[PDB]
Amino acid sequence: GMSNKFLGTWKLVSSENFDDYMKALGVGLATRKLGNSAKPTVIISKKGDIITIRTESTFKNTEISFKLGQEFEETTADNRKTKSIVTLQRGSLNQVQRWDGKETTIKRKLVNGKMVAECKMKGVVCTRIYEKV
């Protein structure tokens, strides 16, 4: 299953193209400004076969709990109500969110002890790097 090397608390240290990513999602300007300013913390944890990914920022906190490969209801930070599935592919945690006939993917993998999130919406690709705290 998911490597335990994912487990822990992670701090955003880099973001690239997040603004176009948020635009692609339909996020408005004032909200994009706060999203570009945010340096969130991501806490990954597990209890049994339930994985929890919690995101904490001054603007918005979010949290999802799921079992691999089982679709669940998610409320995103920009308040989309999505049906989502997290899968494991070559050590990459891959989240797909679907709503209103659209789809975005967030792929999280470990690289030299950092966590790299790649976010994809309509060909826009955003890259966010996190360091373990």
Ligand X SMILES: CCCCCCCCCCCCCCCC(=O)O
Residues engaged in binding ligand X (CB under 6 A): 22, 25, 27, 31, 35, 38, 40, 42, 55, 57, 59-60, 76-78, 106, 117, 119, 128
Distance, CA of 105 to CA of 123 (rounded, Å): 11
**Least spacing, CB of residue 15 vs ligand X, in Å:** 8
CB of 118 within 8 A of CB of 107? yes
| Token pair 């991501």: residue | 42
**Least spacing, CB of residue 108 vs ligand X, in Å:** 7
**Least spacing, CB of residue 25 vs ligand X, in Å:** 6
| Beta-carbon contacts of residue 4 (< 8 Å; ≥ 6 apart) | none
The residue sitting closest to ligand X, measured at its beta carbon, is: 35
